[PDB]
Amino acid sequence: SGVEGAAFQSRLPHDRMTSQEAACFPDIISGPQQTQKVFLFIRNRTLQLWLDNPKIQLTFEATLQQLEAPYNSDTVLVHRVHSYLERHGLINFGIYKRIKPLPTKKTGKVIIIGSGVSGLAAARQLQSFGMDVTLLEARDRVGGRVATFRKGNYVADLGAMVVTGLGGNPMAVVSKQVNMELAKIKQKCPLYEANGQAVPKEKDEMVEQEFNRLLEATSYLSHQLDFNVLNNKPVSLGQALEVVIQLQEKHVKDEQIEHWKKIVKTQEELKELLNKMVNLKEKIKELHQQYKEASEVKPPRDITAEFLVKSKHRDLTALCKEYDELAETQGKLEEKLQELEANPPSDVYLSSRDRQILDWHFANLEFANATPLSTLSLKHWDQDDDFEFTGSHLTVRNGYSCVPVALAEGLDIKLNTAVRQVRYTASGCEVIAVNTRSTSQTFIYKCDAVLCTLPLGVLKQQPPAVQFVPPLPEWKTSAVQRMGFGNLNKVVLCFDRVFWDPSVNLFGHVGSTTASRGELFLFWNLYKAPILLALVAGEAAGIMENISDDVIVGRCLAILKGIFGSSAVPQPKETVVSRWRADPWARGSYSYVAAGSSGNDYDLMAQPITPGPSIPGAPQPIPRLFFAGEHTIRNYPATVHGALLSGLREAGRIADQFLGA
C-alpha cells in the first residue's frame, strides 16, 4: 500500500497505536475503535506526505490541506498528530528547506557533548524547536565514528561504511536530503586459504551451511535447553559453540562405536557358526569312514549288516543336509559383513582445513559484533534481530562523512574542545571543557540541560576522562560496566591500477590458526578509485593496534600476492590504519551485548539523571543530564541510524521538558 508503506518506512505498525502514541493520545487509545482508525490514518497519511518530499518542511496547514473528509473534519486532532510527529522527529527531521523562518527569540539553553551523528541529529531538532544549542567536540572535525579518509580522488571510510538496507531506515530520508552516492553491495564473496587457493565450491557451501547450523544450535541450546548459566557465570556465544562442536564430535565417535560394535556382533555370530561347521565336518568325516567299512563287507549280508550300511547312509545324508544349511547361513553373514565394512560412518566431524574455513565464518561473526565470541551474551547477542531493515545493503561512494558535515550546517560547534567535567544541579548545569591544543585554556558553559553523546568506551574509561558532579548513580555506572564496547579496525590500501575482480565487492582470506582468524580476514572493493579495504576483527583487532602500519601493510600485500601473484600487486600509493581502541574520543568501535548484559541496559543508558534538591525539603527537580548515542538505543544498537534515532528521541524528551508538551 501507500499509507501503510509510510508506517513501515517510519518503523510503526500501520494498523495499531504504539506505546509512545498511547502516552500522548490516552483519550483516543482508551476510547472507541472508530477514532483510532481516524488517528492511525491521519498519522500514516502525514508520514506519507513528509516521506514523499522530505526536502521541504511539512507544516500543519499543508497537512490539513492534503487531508480529505471525514479525516480533515477534526482540526485539533490533526494538529495534535502533526505536533507529536514533529516533536518525536518522525517528520521534519534531517536537512529540509524551512517554510516559516526560525524565531530570533530562543527558549532554553542546551550543551551537547560530541558532534557525532547522535549529537548532530539532536542539535538540529532542538534548534528547529527554538532552543539555544552549542555542541562541544574534542576532535578537529564533526562525524565522530563516521570518519572518511580523503587524499586526492581516494575516498575510504575508516568508521561506518554500510547502510544496512533502506526498508524502514531513517538514512533513506537523509539520502534524498543529502547527495550520498548509494551503491548496492554484491553479496558474492570467494574465500582464499592461507596459501592463495580458492575454497572448492562443494566444500565452501558445506562449511558455511555447518556455521549456520552451529549458530541455530546455540539458539536451541539457549532458548529450549535453558543453558544460560554455568558456574554462576553467564554463558558466552563462544562457550556455546565450543559445547555444540564437542557434542558433534561426540556423536561422530558414538556413531563409529555403534557401527564397529555391530561388526563384532556379526563376527561373533560367524565364529559360533564356523565352530559348529568345523565340528560337524569331523562328525561327517568319521561317519563316512564307518559307512565305507560297513559297505566294504561284500554281500551276501545278514539283515543287521545291511541295516548298518542303510542306517549310516541315512545318518550321513542328514548331517550333509545340516552342513549345507549352515553353509547357506555362512554365505549371507559374509554378505552382511562385506556390506558393513564399506558403509562406515564419518571418520571425523571437521578436518583441519574445515576448522580453518569455519574460523573465517566465526571471524565474520566477530567482525559483525566487533568483539571476540567469548564476550557475547549467548541469550541476547542478537536481541535486535526483529528490527533489522529490508532491502540490499549499500555503501557511500562519496564517503559517509558527507552526512554529518551536512547535518553540521548552521550549528554552533566548538571543535578542539574536550569536556573534562559535567556539573548538574536543581538550578541548572555547567560543562567544563579545555582546548585540546593547549589544555590550560579552560572554558565554562552554563546551560539548563546537558545531552551526553560520549561513546560507551569513554564512559567506561577508568580512571575517568570525564568527571560527573555529582557522580552518576550506581544503576547508570553498573549498566556502563556490564555493557560491551567492541573493537574493529580497517586498513585502507590505495593503488594505481585495479588488480582484482572489479565485479566482486568483497573477498575473504582464511587465517592459518584460530588465534588469528580476525587478522585481515576480509577485503572490500566499493570505491571508484583503486582501493582495497582490509578488516582486523576479533582478538586480532586489540593486538594489531600495537603493531606499526608498515608491518600491517606488509602482511596485507603478502596475503594479496598469494591470491593474485607478485607481478599484479604493486606498492600502495597511500595507506591508513585505524586504531579505534587507542583513539581517546572512542576507546573502541561500537557496543555489543556482553555476557551478563541484555537489551534492558541500553534502556538504562538512555534514562536521564535528575539532580537532588539544592535546599532540603524543596520540590523534586526536573531532569538535567540526558543521554543519546549508539549505546542508548536497544532496537538499533552499534549503527549510524541508531545514533540518528537516539538524537531525535532526546531532542523530543528535552523539548517536552523545557518547552512543555
Partner: peptide, 9 residues
C-alpha cells in the same frame, strides 16, 4: 550486531 554479517543466507 547480526545486521553487519557478510555472506548472509
Amino acid at each position: 550486531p547480526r545486521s553487519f554479517l557478510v555472506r548472509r543466507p
